[PDB]
Amino acid sequence: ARGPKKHLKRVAAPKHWMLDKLTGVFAPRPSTGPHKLRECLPLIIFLRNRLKYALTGDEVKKICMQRFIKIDGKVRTDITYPAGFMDVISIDKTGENFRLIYDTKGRFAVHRITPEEAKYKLCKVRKIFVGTKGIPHLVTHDARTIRYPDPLIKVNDTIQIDLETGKITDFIKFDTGNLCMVTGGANLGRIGVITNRERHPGSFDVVHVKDANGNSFATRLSNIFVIGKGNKPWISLPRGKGIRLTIAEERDKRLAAK
Amino acid sequence: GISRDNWHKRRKTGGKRKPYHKKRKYELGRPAANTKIGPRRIHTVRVRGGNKKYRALRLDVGNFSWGSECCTRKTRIIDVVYNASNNELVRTKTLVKNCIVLIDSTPYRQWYESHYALPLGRKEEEILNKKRSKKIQKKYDERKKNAKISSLLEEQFQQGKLLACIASRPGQCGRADGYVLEGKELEFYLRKIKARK
RNA sequence: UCCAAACUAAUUU
RNA sequence: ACGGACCAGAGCGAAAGCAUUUGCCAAGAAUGUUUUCAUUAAUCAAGAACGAAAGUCGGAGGUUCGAAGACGAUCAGAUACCG
RNA sequence: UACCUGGUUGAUCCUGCCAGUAGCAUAUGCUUGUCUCAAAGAUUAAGCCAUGCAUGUCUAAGUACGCACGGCUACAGUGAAACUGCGAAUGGCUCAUUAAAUCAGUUAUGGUUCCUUUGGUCGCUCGCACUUGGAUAACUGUGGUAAUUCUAGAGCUAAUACAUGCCGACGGGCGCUGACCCCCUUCGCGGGGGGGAUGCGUGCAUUUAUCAGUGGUGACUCUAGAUAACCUCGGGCCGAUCGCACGCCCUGGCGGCGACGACCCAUUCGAACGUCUGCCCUAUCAACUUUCGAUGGUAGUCGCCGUGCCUACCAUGGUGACCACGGGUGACGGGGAAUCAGGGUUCGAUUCCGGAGAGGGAGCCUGAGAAACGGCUACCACAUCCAAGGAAGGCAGCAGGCGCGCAAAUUACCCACUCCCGACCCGGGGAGGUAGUGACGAAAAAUAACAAUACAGGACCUGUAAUUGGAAUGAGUCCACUUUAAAUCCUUUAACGAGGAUCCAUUGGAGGGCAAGUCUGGUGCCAGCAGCCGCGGUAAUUCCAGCUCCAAUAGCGUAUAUUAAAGUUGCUGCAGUUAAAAAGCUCGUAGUUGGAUCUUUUUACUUUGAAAAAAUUAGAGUGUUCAAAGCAGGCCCGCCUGGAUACCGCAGCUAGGAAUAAUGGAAUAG
RNA sequence: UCCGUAACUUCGGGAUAAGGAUUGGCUCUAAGGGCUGGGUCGGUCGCGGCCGGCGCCUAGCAGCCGACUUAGAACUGGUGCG
Ligand SMILES: [Mg+2]
Ligand SMILES: [Mg+2]
Ligand SMILES: [Mg+2]
Ligand SMILES: [Mg+2]
Ligand SMILES: [Mg+2]
Ligand SMILES: [Mg+2]
Ligand SMILES: [Mg+2]
Ligand SMILES: [Mg+2]
Ligand SMILES: [Mg+2]
Ligand SMILES: [Mg+2]
Ligand SMILES: [Mg+2]
Ligand SMILES: [Mg+2]
Ligand SMILES: [Mg+2]
Ligand SMILES: [Mg+2]
Ligand SMILES: [Mg+2]
Ligand SMILES: [Mg+2]
Ligand SMILES: [Mg+2]
Ligand SMILES: [Mg+2]
Ligand SMILES: [Mg+2]
Ligand SMILES: [Mg+2]
Ligand SMILES: [Mg+2]
Ligand SMILES: [Mg+2]
Ligand SMILES: [Mg+2]
Ligand SMILES: [Mg+2]
Ligand SMILES: [Mg+2]
């Protein structure tokens, strides 16, 4: 191309959006924002293909232009705003206050949280740098920036910020035994405690995570998101608590529910 | 136009490679600035990203550093005496990033005579032979201890011409900054100039 | 240890 | 020029090939070995040495035989067989 | 389904090919009732193109004095046009170019740019404001021209266009300078401790030198700090802008929310250039590259940056039988597709990802992004109007036409769905969607069923009939609903609609391979058939016909590419005494392969973990009426539930294993 | 001067094959040599030496001298230049 792409084909879309291949040729290419394109969830396919509030695309913008949708305490009107992990969608008219967290199969679950849980969120510390006059900064997995963070908060740690304030409330260090969620790869959505952070200089670091059944698995350090301190998750986990059943152990769960 | 691609080169083996696309715009090159000495003439080029880089076609005034006192003044360039890259850039008075230049020394004599009260390169009276109060006159006496410039560098102040060196890239930044040659780097370039004579 | 070459196109098992 | 008989389902040589006597020169297999070295090997594009007979080019020699050639026969023909 | 059959002979066993056989995909032939999906000018000509369309865009929120409309005093409110802004670099089409190139996996940018979006930052600088300047379009008015989305002259008038530019913060602080005062000593000299006027400088960004060693990294010449400065007139920043609601303090003075813009730092979408490994045929291509850069060093120039990218000065290198270089390709690469026991073989123009080009080349403007072609500028080729003066061109966009050919569709309707762009809830989209043409192909499935007789059978059951009987339905016709942007079709339901149920099933065959006749008539080595062996010269099981029969059936022949068959290319798996074939013999470098030995250092190997685009394939779940499909669905105010898993050569990464296979340690002990 | 050279061949030749470019003036720039001295402390008297403590040019400097030639570049002329 001579410049940046603007469309997105239907079959070339991300798998976890769960679009179908006979509705149209294209998929909603999400706008540029705080989340990556393969790691986001656009607002139109959340309101239309999950919640059934609208039936077409034009009925989504009739919701959004009436300013009924809030993201992170702020009104967003774009139908392809990239919403992502640990984000809070506040509809607030029906009073629902969603929080996007992956299920155990690796797609965004329609997950409801309590309307005082929607005051805050969690963020992974991606970068620490100082600025002019020696002022430290902090960059999250979202594109937001915090001036004057806590001196103990280092890279890959998880902070808890307040929406509508934008300041740091509390943080969790990346340590052994803390409670984390996997945000990428073949273990997308699984939850367990950190067993061992295996270091490799130059290349990627690998973290072994032990599930709450005895199962263990490993993932790169760039996909590990700490969600709890010790064994206590600081959010409300979805239905299943991040346990990946085998394909036999989810057959009988269907078979013992008929 | 002027392309700075790689695909017009032959391969490592010596095989001629065949082009697979027309020459793209991010592979452009532009003509050299060939910055001379004279009254200031600077052109700006719109470059990739919408940015601007300043290319200077004539420059007479620079910003050079004395180095061993952290004394940087804005002085005037007289001429070019040496160029390691091409001998015929000296004859046409072209200023490039490492060429050895020759500058007026009077901002460096004037600062030195004010910081040490000692004549430099002399065979008005107020800054040198001033009546100082004895607390102030005390302060100039520990500066008097370390006031000795090397013998190769006191020669330069008598002719009023320091031998200097460009450090910036004129024709990219539009300026000519650099530092004064001193020490073993001075006497290396001194005998190269004497050998060409 | 004398010589001694050739053989319907006219077809049906 | 040629080395009969002896001369063989015998020998030697990488193969082509190799036979009178004696001398000289260098080689080599097999056997023998309680010597020595200690894997130095096997097969091999490119490359290399050898390679009957006929043929080629120089010298020498030319007895026998003998392509080509010339005749005598035979033959329907016989520029072939035989002389 | 890991399959063979005919053909050399008088007969036999062989080697061996030819011929069958089965898909697949292109053309074609004959035929064709229904209905659901669906390819479709790639192959030859990346040949040439008439006409039309395919890209524009306005909110309460940049600029309305167009009465073009319009309500009751700077400006109501709509608002054409015009300026300004933004997009037009995406999409779409085609496969010519291109053989470590493109591309794929893998990594890097600690070697770079990045409009927008989102989050920071935006009184950090000591130095007319209650608003500054000029211009221009729309409009009006005079025109020119054969001509065009040509434009001239004159009068107006705007800004978030274009310029210019201040107050406030703002009290100073901090560095340097140092007049000067002051205190404690001192025989004195000297020495010691504060205050300090007046001057110079001061923030980010930029550029260079130097000093010190807040946070980070495997690793910085990183980030931050300190100092000396500089800061381009073709000029970095530091708001002369707009709308909502409008309150509050004592004319004044403050205040809520937005929009728009900003240098810079992140972020997002990327982009570009690098790392490692991987490609078809060819030796009747064996050496190639290099003072016209080939390989490297030093310094620069250029560039967004690393770099022989380029220049100067040097060095003489670099690549190659492990196939360089050269040539070819009926070569865009890949995901993939057809065939298939296991291995393979062939294909991939073609809807997804990546690349390329817009008649051929070349050069550029604008912009964040282009060497752009529904942008300019040339020249070549071609071609269009012309009053001969000139002007305009680019369908490998959708349609359409010509040409080329064995070979490929309507100059249809629509922004309703999918999404994209814009100032935008309103506009636009030949992207896309829907119809038409559609035996490319794929799924489903009519052309009769029954009963009684007449008869035949079988050990009460069954068959045969130009006999008979009323039962059942679609095809078709056809109202209406539904469907949808409006339709159409399907689905639904009235009305009709079957006896030769004339509402008629073809395509190939009948010696053998190979399912099916020694029937009848004609022809007489003729006409003809026949893939192969063959047939025909007067009783043709083979031709031409009739009768019968067979095969598969709304499909079936035929041509050609190709796969299996083919263990007839042989890795699995072939041969080489006489059938095709082992070089005359030996040496010999590459290459290939290498004896035994030990517990009973680097790799290869093996196992595992990551990270690996979907679609396709395998496969889970689910009654599209079934099936091909599809990702749906299911249960009585709503509730419940799916949208799995596997596989993804090699290379690179990770942790276990230590047999096998390489390799390494102490012999002048260095 | 710099490039570039076929058929044919007794492999020597053909060959100055053929074919093309360049050439002035001026101002510079590189490159190509030769002769001398590398003597550290008077250890210390027959401003010079007599025998040796005293030292590291050793990747060569420094002085003087000297021909001719090749290459490159800028400028310059009514495109002229063997
Ligand atoms: Mg004898
Ligand atoms: Mg050989
Ligand atoms: Mg012979
Ligand atoms: Mg002779
Ligand atoms: Mg005779
Ligand atoms: Mg026979
Ligand atoms: Mg065959
Ligand atoms: Mg495109
Ligand atoms: Mg990026
Ligand atoms: Mg070709
Ligand atoms: Mg292009
Ligand atoms: Mg064309
Ligand atoms: Mg172009
Ligand atoms: Mg076009
Ligand atoms: Mg067709
Ligand atoms: Mg079919
Ligand atoms: Mg019919
Ligand atoms: Mg047959
Ligand atoms: Mg085959
Ligand atoms: Mg087979
Ligand atoms: Mg065979
Ligand atoms: Mg044979
Ligand atoms: Mg032999
Ligand atoms: Mg062994
Ligand atoms: Mg001649």
Same domain? B165 vs B123: no
Residue A30 and residue A94: Cα distance in Å, rounded? 25
Assess whether A95 (CB) lies less than 7 A from strand E. no
Same domain? B166 vs B90: yes
Nearest by Cα to A46 from A24, A76, A73, A8:
A76
Segment (H or E) for A253: helix A251-255
Q: Where are the beta strands (DSSP E) in chain B?
A: 41-46, 52-58, 61-65, 72-82, 100-104, 161-166, 177-180
Same domain? B92 vs B169: yes
Residue A96 and residue A70: Cα distance in Å, rounded? 11
Nearest by Cα to A26 from A12, A10, A4:
A10
Q: B89-92: long-range contacts (C-beta < 8 A, 24 or more apart)?
A: B92/B34, B92/B36
Same domain? B87 vs B144: no
Number of H helices, E strands in chain A: 3, 20
Q: Which nucleotide's C1' atom has the smallest distance to the CA of A49?
A: E643
Assess whether A3 (CB) lies less than 7 A from strand E. yes
Same domain? B93 vs B175: yes
Q: Distance, angstroms, CA A149 to C1' F24?
A: 80
Range of the domain at B12: 1-30
Residue B53 and residue A163: Cα distance in Å, rounded? 43
Residue A78, both tokens: 């774009």
Assess whether B142 (CB) lies less than 7 A from strand F. no
Same domain? B54 vs B141: no
Assess whether B174 (CB) lies less than 7 A from strand E. yes
Question: Which ranges constitute the DSSP H helices of chain B?
Answer: 88-91, 106-116, 134-142, 151-158, 184-196
CA of residue B122 to ligand 13 center, whole Å? 68
Classify B157 as helix, strand or coil: helix
Breaks following residues of chain B (C-to-N distance > 2.5 Å): 123
The resolution in angstroms reads 2.8
Assess whether B139 (CB) lies less than 7 A from strand F. no
Tokens 């024709």 found at: B171
**Residue B141 carries which DSSP code?**
H
Q: A137-142: long-range contacts (C-beta < 8 A, 24 or more apart)?
A: A141/A85, A141/A86, A141/A225, A142/A34, A142/A35, A142/A84, A142/A87
Assess whether B21 (CB) lies less than 7 A from strand E. yes
Neighbours of B149 (CB within 10 A): 19
Same domain? B35 vs B112: no
Same domain? B116 vs B155: yes
Q: Distance, angstroms, CA A113 to C1' E597?
A: 73
Give CA angle at B152 (B149, B157), nearest 5°.
Answer: 70
Contacting residues for B113 by C-beta, under 8 A, at least 6 apart: B119, B120, B127, B128
- Contact present, B132 and B116 (Cβ < 8 Å): no
Classify B106 as helix, strand or coil: helix
Assess whether B91 (CB) lies less than 7 A from strand F. yes
Neighbours of B34 (CB within 10 A): 16
Neighbours of A69 (CB within 10 A): 24
Classify A44 as helix, strand or coil: helix
Q: Distance, angstroms, CA A10 to C1' E107?
A: 29
Same domain? B47 vs B101: yes
Classify A168 as helix, strand or coil: strand
Q: Distance, angstroms, CA B27 to C1' E371?
A: 10
CA of residue B130 to ligand 17 center, whole Å? 131
Classify A131 as helix, strand or coil: coil
Neighbours of B183 (CB within 10 A): 12
Classify B151 as helix, strand or coil: helix
Same domain? B71 vs B117: no
- Count structural domains, chain B: 3
Same domain? B82 vs B9: no
- Contact present, B108 and B65 (Cβ < 8 Å): no
Q: Across the beta sheet with A98-99, what order do the strands follow?
A: A74-75, A70-71, A88-90, A98-99
Q: B74 forms bridges with which residues in the sheet? A: B63
Buried b or exposed e, range A3-40, using 16+ CB within 10 angstroms:
eeeeebeeeebbebbebeeeeeeebbbbeebbbeeeeb
Assess whether B192 (CB) lies less than 7 A from strand F. no
Q: Distance, angstroms, CA B177 to C1' E31?
A: 93
Q: Distance, angstroms, CA A97 to C1' E243?
A: 32
Nearest by Cα to B180 from B86, B38, B77:
B77
Same domain? B79 vs B123: no
Q: Kindly tell me the burial class for residue A106, based on how many C-beta atoms sit within 10 Å of its own C-beta (0-12, 13-18, 19 or more).
A: middle
Contacting residues for A26 by C-beta, under 8 A, at least 6 apart: A7, A8, A9, A10
Segment (H or E) for A251: helix A251-255
Tokens 């989340």 found at: A35
Q: B137 forms bridges with which residues in the sheet? A: none
Rounded to the nearest 5°, which phi and psi values hold at B41? -135, 110
Query: Terminal CA-to-CA distance of chain A, rounded, Å?
Result: 53
CA of residue B154 to ligand 5 center, whole Å? 123
**Biggest CA pair distance of chain A:** 67
Assess whether A107 (CB) lies less than 7 A from strand E. yes
Q: Distance, angstroms, CA A56 to C1' E83?
A: 39
CA of residue A41 to ligand 4 center, whole Å? 102
Q: Distance, angstroms, CA A156 to C1' E221?
A: 28
Give CA angle at A65 (A64, A71), nearest 5°.
Answer: 45
Q: How was this structure determined?
A: cryo-EM
Q: Kindly tell me the burial class for residue B122, based on how many C-beta atoms sit within 10 Å of its own C-beta (0-12, 13-18, 19 or more).
A: exposed
Residue A182, both tokens: 């996997």
Residue A149 and residue A138: Cα distance in Å, rounded? 7
Q: Distance, angstroms, CA B95 to C1' F74?
A: 18
- Contact present, B143 and B132 (Cβ < 8 Å): no
CA of residue A117 to ligand 5 center, whole Å? 129
On strand F, nucleotides with any atom < 7 Å from a protein CB are 28-30, 62, 72-73
Q: Which nucleotide's C1' atom has the smallest distance to the CA of B90?
A: F29
CA of residue A61 to ligand 9 center, whole Å? 29
